[PDB]
């Protein structure tokens, strides 16, 4: 009977009105079955035509063993309710989580289902289960309880979460716990063995207060290695004209980021019109430029800090051999974080799956470091991604994304 | 009427429409009273008092031989709350499943058979005027869903669905499809049983106030629905008419392209490239556009395709879903979706309008995505693909493409025109080959440019150019090096543009210059294109 926490949209902001993407017959049936039981438990209820709002709904298999889950793209509602979960109720972000050696993630979204939602706000939680070939109008539900995927749900459950976590935070004062959406990030410096046992302690402390947590045992994420990776120049015994050409061009690109790089001595080495395959020995004066530009290329950039008022931007580029690379930034050439994602050797691997897994890997790291997700510039056809991104999505959140139609001129510069 | 009403509001911070009934045609006013009295008799409207209930204008017109009442609700519609959108998408016949008997039923008075929320009935007020002094000033409000109102279609559809819900549970075997004011009941029962259930449904709807067709079910197959001919065991588009003229306006080319596209869903081979190119001018609709020789060929070829009727089958969920793609002409592609060879569920085409340079493999990848989307929309699954491309051809492409592409389950089809990589650039420089240092430039004002090269062997050439762009000369310099080199050549350019076009490995383009470069690249045994930063001085090409 907990009094509903009233939610008000920003003045001048109407509710979300997003279309429902067409789905497989298999996925529609799983949603109808899930929603039928959710309606039976009072979590959701059907609505009439006087509700014009809609939020897209999808189906994933997190456990992947006869386990269909419902995922709602509350991205638009999150933007139009930002003042509620970013100003009125705000979950502060710890900066010590990135310093901890191991950070385990736990799903705690089931706690929101007990808390009711304000009757006046339930209109904006509306979603539609689509019908195949428009044979019938969709099935229209709205949430009566706190909806998972909405950023206002953990902000409302914030006080209840802090109260439940208080005994565990007391016995373990050095463990950092952060709540982003439906997931609890738990960071410590302990040995992996006793870290997992301490995580199992928190899992049982959460359980004895009525908070269910998936017990499928999402490996631990170690953020000590996280850094802006250094740009590496090729290392060869003997050099050719072409290898020095690729070297001069790469350092000219780094001049936009790293100033103080000089290639003129290397440019003097390649002067007369010569064959690319012609092996030109390295002069000592230009060799000094290679060593001077290897040293300055391992120092971090200057004047690169995170801006809380600006959004994060993540660019992924495909390097081949089942490997991808990424750069998180806010202003161009000022990289807050770079890295590379390489899928473990797998015959089942596909380009979309690797990009999907990369986006989830990048978003999680970005959540741990900054407490908010970036907007991805995805190297994929728009309609291709919008069709198959749900097939490998194992996360409860969905980051913003757009699609790049302009190719990268040189892939090797990032790698 | 016992149907439960739907609560309707006005948009926040708005009030009822208070328009005035300016027109005062005495002839029409009497005919309006004759309708409003016999419509008040049926309870669809009710006279209202002098207390301001706002006002909405009314007019009269004649199509029987009876005048009709029209109420301009645009002001109300602007002030009414938004509703859930009635799906614009219509079911495609290729997705429907064959039913032994299909019955179409139309509701006579749809919106006037469904009530309206009482608190919202004041805003529907309207005035019947009188030219006489001491004007009687007849006033009325709507008790049912008015015509041309914003919420009438969505409220009717949900009310109809809630009315069908008891019948559907009692009779789960029958299948009812709802579209606007129509119901399409399909059953695999014996015809005598089917006709009993239909009359049972008509009685159901009459108890709720919904008129159903008399004369049993006034619907004889085939059915003409949304430009589709629907038959018991087949479907096809309603007959297409292609006009023959001497002059063609932009209006006529639009209508012709539309009718051609509509035929593409069943008639295989339709092309609309050259005809749509005439529309690329996008001038005023009234202007007359001269037909080209290639567009008149497409129309003659399309008229030959439409000369003999072709039909399509319905979906059988028990069987596999297959789609076959064939390349057509200049980047146009045609696909056919079937479950059995001689009978196709539907057909279609794909064209790559966006972009100036592309290759065949990328267009085929895009076509599969288009078919994958359409198959999900119509049948809730993706099809098995029969594609005219070797696996090693596709595998070589996606492993080195900068984007990510998903290749579904597919088998090879040896029916030409096949899809192949006409050329592949070298990844490392070629030893024992000449090295062409190319560069091109032009002045924007003069439009006069020059392109040339300087080889390692000392060979040099400069060719003048007129009416060119810096990009057109940067590609021209590479074309020169290709013309003047052996079957193995190393080219070095300072143009990220020219490097970009070539490294994308296109096999066709709009610019004639790129087409000639593709020809040389195909002729050459080995080509290594490399890039260096301009103005560093290493290139040494100064013109
Ligand atoms: N006017 C019109 C019209 C009829 C229909 C329609 O008919 C069906 C209704 C329920 C089940 C299967 C159906 O049809 C399946 C295919 N079919 C269609 C016609 C026929 O005679 N036999 C047959 O098996 C469905 C969708 C749009 N429609 C538009």
CSV table of N, CA and C in Angstrom, one decimal, chain B residues 397-486:
chain,number,residue,atom,x,y,z
B,397,UNK,N,34.4,-11.0,-49.4
B,397,UNK,CA,33.9,-9.6,-49.3
B,397,UNK,C,33.6,-9.2,-47.9
B,398,UNK,N,32.9,-10.0,-47.1
B,398,UNK,CA,32.5,-9.6,-45.8
B,398,UNK,C,33.6,-9.6,-44.8
B,399,UNK,N,34.6,-10.4,-45.1
B,399,UNK,CA,35.8,-10.5,-44.2
B,399,UNK,C,36.7,-9.3,-44.3
B,400,UNK,N,36.6,-8.5,-45.4
B,400,UNK,CA,37.4,-7.3,-45.6
B,400,UNK,C,36.5,-6.0,-45.7
B,401,UNK,N,35.2,-6.1,-45.5
B,401,UNK,CA,34.3,-5.0,-45.6
B,401,UNK,C,34.4,-4.2,-44.3
B,402,UNK,N,34.4,-2.9,-44.3
B,402,UNK,CA,34.5,-2.1,-43.1
B,402,UNK,C,33.3,-2.1,-42.2
B,403,UNK,N,32.1,-2.4,-42.8
B,403,UNK,CA,30.9,-2.5,-42.1
B,403,UNK,C,30.8,-4.0,-41.6
B,404,UNK,N,29.7,-4.2,-40.8
B,404,UNK,CA,29.3,-5.5,-40.4
B,404,UNK,C,28.1,-5.9,-41.2
B,405,UNK,N,28.0,-7.2,-41.6
B,405,UNK,CA,26.9,-7.7,-42.4
B,405,UNK,C,26.6,-9.1,-41.9
B,406,UNK,N,25.3,-9.4,-41.8
B,406,UNK,CA,24.8,-10.7,-41.4
B,406,UNK,C,24.3,-11.4,-42.6
B,407,UNK,N,24.9,-12.6,-42.9
B,407,UNK,CA,24.5,-13.5,-44.0
B,407,UNK,C,23.7,-14.6,-43.5
B,408,UNK,N,22.4,-14.6,-43.8
B,408,UNK,CA,21.5,-15.7,-43.3
B,408,UNK,C,21.8,-17.0,-44.0
B,409,UNK,N,20.9,-18.0,-43.8
B,409,UNK,CA,21.1,-19.3,-44.4
B,409,UNK,C,20.8,-19.1,-45.9
B,410,UNK,N,21.7,-19.6,-46.8
B,410,UNK,CA,21.6,-19.4,-48.2
B,410,UNK,C,22.3,-20.5,-48.9
B,411,UNK,N,21.8,-20.8,-50.1
B,411,UNK,CA,22.4,-21.8,-51.0
B,411,UNK,C,22.7,-21.1,-52.3
B,412,UNK,N,23.7,-21.6,-53.1
B,412,UNK,CA,24.1,-21.0,-54.3
B,412,UNK,C,23.2,-21.4,-55.5
B,413,UNK,N,23.0,-20.5,-56.4
B,413,UNK,CA,22.2,-20.8,-57.6
B,413,UNK,C,23.1,-20.3,-58.8
B,414,UNK,N,23.3,-21.2,-59.7
B,414,UNK,CA,24.2,-21.0,-60.8
B,414,UNK,C,23.6,-20.3,-62.0
B,415,UNK,N,22.4,-19.7,-61.8
B,415,UNK,CA,21.7,-19.0,-62.9
B,415,UNK,C,22.3,-17.6,-63.1
B,416,UNK,N,22.9,-17.4,-64.2
B,416,UNK,CA,23.5,-16.1,-64.5
B,416,UNK,C,22.5,-15.0,-64.7
B,417,UNK,N,22.8,-13.7,-64.6
B,417,UNK,CA,24.1,-13.1,-64.3
B,417,UNK,C,24.6,-13.4,-62.8
B,418,UNK,N,25.8,-14.0,-62.7
B,418,UNK,CA,26.3,-14.3,-61.4
B,418,UNK,C,26.8,-13.0,-60.7
B,419,UNK,N,27.2,-13.1,-59.5
B,419,UNK,CA,27.8,-12.0,-58.7
B,419,UNK,C,29.2,-12.4,-58.3
B,420,UNK,N,30.2,-11.6,-58.7
B,420,UNK,CA,31.6,-11.9,-58.5
B,420,UNK,C,32.3,-10.6,-58.2
B,421,UNK,N,33.5,-10.8,-57.7
B,421,UNK,CA,34.5,-9.7,-57.5
B,421,UNK,C,35.3,-9.5,-58.7
B,422,UNK,N,35.0,-8.4,-59.5
B,422,UNK,CA,35.7,-8.3,-60.8
B,422,UNK,C,37.1,-7.9,-60.7
B,423,UNK,N,37.5,-7.3,-59.5
B,423,UNK,CA,38.9,-7.0,-59.3
B,423,UNK,C,39.2,-6.9,-57.8
B,424,UNK,N,40.4,-7.2,-57.4
B,424,UNK,CA,40.8,-7.1,-56.0
B,424,UNK,C,42.2,-6.4,-55.9
B,425,UNK,N,42.2,-5.3,-55.2
B,425,UNK,CA,43.5,-4.5,-55.0
B,425,UNK,C,44.4,-5.3,-54.2
B,426,UNK,N,45.7,-5.1,-54.4
B,426,UNK,CA,46.8,-5.8,-53.6
B,426,UNK,C,46.9,-5.1,-52.2
B,427,UNK,N,47.2,-6.0,-51.3
B,427,UNK,CA,47.4,-5.5,-49.9
B,427,UNK,C,48.8,-5.0,-49.6
B,428,UNK,N,49.8,-5.6,-50.2
B,428,UNK,CA,51.2,-5.2,-50.1
B,428,UNK,C,51.7,-4.8,-51.5
B,429,UNK,N,52.7,-3.9,-51.5
B,429,UNK,CA,53.2,-3.4,-52.8
B,429,UNK,C,53.8,-4.5,-53.6
B,430,UNK,N,53.9,-4.3,-54.9
B,430,UNK,CA,54.3,-5.3,-55.9
B,430,UNK,C,55.7,-5.0,-56.3
B,431,UNK,N,56.6,-6.0,-56.0
B,431,UNK,CA,58.0,-5.9,-56.4
B,431,UNK,C,58.1,-6.2,-57.9
B,432,UNK,N,59.1,-5.7,-58.6
B,432,UNK,CA,59.2,-5.9,-60.0
B,432,UNK,C,58.2,-5.1,-60.8
B,433,UNK,N,57.7,-4.0,-60.3
B,433,UNK,CA,56.7,-3.2,-60.9
B,433,UNK,C,57.0,-1.7,-60.8
B,434,UNK,N,56.6,-1.0,-61.8
B,434,UNK,CA,56.8,0.5,-61.8
B,434,UNK,C,55.9,1.1,-60.8
B,435,UNK,N,56.4,2.3,-60.3
B,435,UNK,CA,55.7,3.1,-59.3
B,435,UNK,C,55.3,4.4,-59.8
B,436,UNK,N,54.0,4.7,-60.0
B,436,UNK,CA,53.5,5.9,-60.6
B,436,UNK,C,53.1,6.8,-59.4
B,437,UNK,N,53.7,8.0,-59.4
B,437,UNK,CA,53.4,9.1,-58.4
B,437,UNK,C,52.4,10.0,-59.2
B,438,UNK,N,51.1,9.9,-58.9
B,438,UNK,CA,50.1,10.6,-59.6
B,438,UNK,C,49.7,11.8,-58.7
B,439,UNK,N,49.1,12.8,-59.4
B,439,UNK,CA,48.5,14.0,-58.7
B,439,UNK,C,47.7,14.7,-59.7
B,440,UNK,N,46.6,15.3,-59.3
B,440,UNK,CA,45.8,16.1,-60.1
B,440,UNK,C,45.3,17.4,-59.4
B,441,UNK,N,45.0,18.4,-60.2
B,441,UNK,CA,44.6,19.7,-59.7
B,441,UNK,C,43.8,20.4,-60.7
B,442,UNK,N,43.1,21.5,-60.3
B,442,UNK,CA,42.3,22.3,-61.1
B,442,UNK,C,42.0,23.6,-60.4
B,443,UNK,N,41.6,24.6,-61.2
B,443,UNK,CA,41.2,25.9,-60.7
B,443,UNK,C,39.7,26.0,-60.7
B,444,UNK,N,39.0,26.3,-59.6
B,444,UNK,CA,37.6,26.3,-59.6
B,444,UNK,C,37.0,27.3,-60.5
B,445,UNK,N,37.6,28.5,-60.6
B,445,UNK,CA,37.0,29.6,-61.4
B,445,UNK,C,37.2,29.2,-62.9
B,446,UNK,N,38.4,28.9,-63.3
B,446,UNK,CA,38.7,28.6,-64.7
B,446,UNK,C,38.0,27.3,-65.2
B,447,UNK,N,37.8,26.4,-64.2
B,447,UNK,CA,37.3,25.0,-64.5
B,447,UNK,C,38.3,24.3,-65.4
B,448,UNK,N,39.6,24.7,-65.5
B,448,UNK,CA,40.6,24.1,-66.2
B,448,UNK,C,41.6,23.4,-65.3
B,449,UNK,N,41.9,22.2,-65.6
B,449,UNK,CA,42.7,21.4,-64.7
B,449,UNK,C,43.8,20.7,-65.5
B,450,UNK,N,44.7,20.0,-64.7
B,450,UNK,CA,45.8,19.2,-65.3
B,450,UNK,C,46.0,18.0,-64.4
B,451,UNK,N,46.3,16.9,-65.0
B,451,UNK,CA,46.6,15.6,-64.3
B,451,UNK,C,47.8,15.0,-64.9
B,452,UNK,N,48.6,14.3,-64.1
B,452,UNK,CA,49.8,13.7,-64.6
B,452,UNK,C,50.4,12.7,-63.6
B,453,UNK,N,51.6,12.2,-64.0
B,453,UNK,CA,52.3,11.2,-63.1
B,453,UNK,C,53.8,11.4,-63.3
B,454,UNK,N,54.5,10.8,-62.4
B,454,UNK,CA,56.0,10.7,-62.5
B,454,UNK,C,56.4,9.3,-62.0
B,455,UNK,N,57.0,8.5,-62.9
B,455,UNK,CA,57.3,7.1,-62.5
B,455,UNK,C,58.7,7.1,-61.9
B,456,UNK,N,59.1,5.9,-61.3
B,456,UNK,CA,60.4,5.7,-60.8
B,456,UNK,C,61.4,5.6,-61.9
B,457,UNK,N,61.0,5.0,-63.0
B,457,UNK,CA,61.9,4.8,-64.1
B,457,UNK,C,62.2,6.1,-64.9
B,458,UNK,N,61.6,7.2,-64.4
B,458,UNK,CA,61.8,8.5,-65.1
B,458,UNK,C,60.8,8.9,-66.0
B,459,UNK,N,59.8,8.1,-66.3
B,459,UNK,CA,58.7,8.4,-67.2
B,459,UNK,C,57.8,9.4,-66.6
B,460,UNK,N,57.4,10.5,-67.4
B,460,UNK,CA,56.6,11.5,-66.9
B,460,UNK,C,55.6,11.9,-67.9
B,461,UNK,N,54.4,12.4,-67.5
B,461,UNK,CA,53.4,12.8,-68.4
B,461,UNK,C,52.5,13.8,-67.7
B,462,UNK,N,52.0,14.8,-68.5
B,462,UNK,CA,51.0,15.8,-68.0
B,462,UNK,C,50.0,16.0,-69.1
B,463,UNK,N,48.7,15.8,-68.8
B,463,UNK,CA,47.6,16.0,-69.8
B,463,UNK,C,46.8,17.1,-69.3
B,464,UNK,N,46.4,18.1,-70.2
B,464,UNK,CA,45.5,19.2,-69.8
B,464,UNK,C,44.1,18.7,-69.8
B,465,UNK,N,43.3,19.4,-68.9
B,465,UNK,CA,41.9,19.0,-68.7
B,465,UNK,C,41.0,20.3,-68.7
B,466,UNK,N,39.8,20.2,-69.3
B,466,UNK,CA,38.9,21.3,-69.3
B,466,UNK,C,37.6,20.9,-68.6
B,467,UNK,N,36.9,21.8,-68.0
B,467,UNK,CA,35.6,21.6,-67.3
B,467,UNK,C,35.7,20.4,-66.3
B,468,UNK,N,36.7,20.5,-65.5
B,468,UNK,CA,36.9,19.4,-64.5
B,468,UNK,C,36.9,20.0,-63.1
B,469,UNK,N,36.8,19.1,-62.1
B,469,UNK,CA,36.9,19.4,-60.7
B,469,UNK,C,38.1,18.7,-60.1
B,470,UNK,N,38.6,19.3,-59.0
B,470,UNK,CA,39.8,18.7,-58.4
B,470,UNK,C,39.6,17.2,-58.1
B,471,UNK,N,38.4,16.8,-57.7
B,471,UNK,CA,38.2,15.4,-57.5
B,471,UNK,C,38.2,14.7,-58.9
B,472,UNK,N,37.7,15.3,-59.9
B,472,UNK,CA,37.7,14.6,-61.2
B,472,UNK,C,39.1,14.5,-61.8
B,473,UNK,N,40.0,15.4,-61.4
B,473,UNK,CA,41.4,15.3,-61.9
B,473,UNK,C,42.2,14.4,-61.0
B,474,UNK,N,41.9,14.3,-59.7
B,474,UNK,CA,42.5,13.3,-58.8
B,474,UNK,C,42.2,11.9,-59.2
B,475,UNK,N,41.0,11.6,-59.7
B,475,UNK,CA,40.7,10.4,-60.4
B,475,UNK,C,41.3,10.3,-61.8
B,476,UNK,N,41.4,11.4,-62.5
B,476,UNK,CA,42.0,11.4,-63.8
B,476,UNK,C,43.5,11.0,-63.8
B,477,UNK,N,44.2,11.5,-62.7
B,477,UNK,CA,45.6,11.1,-62.6
B,477,UNK,C,45.8,9.6,-62.4
B,478,UNK,N,44.9,9.0,-61.7
B,478,UNK,CA,45.0,7.6,-61.5
B,478,UNK,C,44.7,6.8,-62.7
B,479,UNK,N,43.7,7.3,-63.5
B,479,UNK,CA,43.3,6.7,-64.8
B,479,UNK,C,44.5,6.8,-65.8
B,480,UNK,N,45.2,7.9,-65.7
B,480,UNK,CA,46.4,8.0,-66.6
B,480,UNK,C,47.5,7.0,-66.3
B,481,UNK,N,47.8,6.8,-65.0
B,481,UNK,CA,48.8,5.8,-64.6
B,481,UNK,C,48.4,4.4,-65.0
B,482,UNK,N,47.1,4.1,-65.0
B,482,UNK,CA,46.6,2.8,-65.4
B,482,UNK,C,46.8,2.6,-66.9
B,483,UNK,N,46.5,3.7,-67.7
B,483,UNK,CA,46.6,3.6,-69.1
B,483,UNK,C,48.0,3.4,-69.6
B,484,UNK,N,49.0,4.0,-68.8
B,484,UNK,CA,50.4,4.0,-69.3
B,484,UNK,C,51.3,3.0,-68.6
B,485,UNK,N,50.8,2.1,-67.8
B,485,UNK,CA,51.6,1.1,-67.1
B,485,UNK,C,51.3,-0.3,-67.6
B,486,UNK,N,52.1,-1.2,-67.1
B,486,UNK,CA,52.0,-2.6,-67.5
B,486,UNK,C,50.9,-3.3,-66.7
